[PDB]
Design a binder for this molecule. Structure first.
Ligand SMILES: [Cl-]
Ligand SMILES: [Zn+2]
Ligand SMILES: [Zn+2]
Ligand SMILES: [Zn+2]
Ligand SMILES: [Zn+2]
Ligand SMILES: [Zn+2]
Ligand SMILES: [Zn+2]
Ligand SMILES: [Zn+2]
Length: 77
């Protein structure tokens, strides 16, 4: 599913265990993402799902849930 694909991208990048990759988990505060990690995650989500995440929207992506909910409104699943 889209959800699992997103979680896998996050696990690959951060080396965090999937049990912690929940919808309300903050990339920075909960998953330990540093500034480079967040830039790389956004880049990865864009390339994987063939969409763009403009800077203004990227700044508003703080949790795993934000990414999933946003993507579900941009792709079919
Ligand atoms: Cl999809
Ligand atoms: Zn993988
Ligand atoms: Zn486990
Ligand atoms: Zn937290
Ligand atoms: Zn890199
Ligand atoms: Zn890009
Ligand atoms: Zn972009
Ligand atoms: Zn916007």
């Amino acid at each position: 599913s889209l959800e699992e694909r997103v979680k896998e991208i996050i696990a690959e990048q951060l080396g965090v265990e999937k049990e912690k990759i929940t919808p309300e988990a903050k990339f920075v505060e909960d998953l330990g993402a540093d500034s480079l990690d967040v830039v790389e995650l956004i880049m990865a989500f864009e390339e994987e799902f063939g969409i763009e995440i403009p800077d203004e929207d990227a700044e508003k992506i703080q949790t795993v849930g934000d990414v999933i909910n946003y993507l579900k409104e941009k792709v079919g699943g």
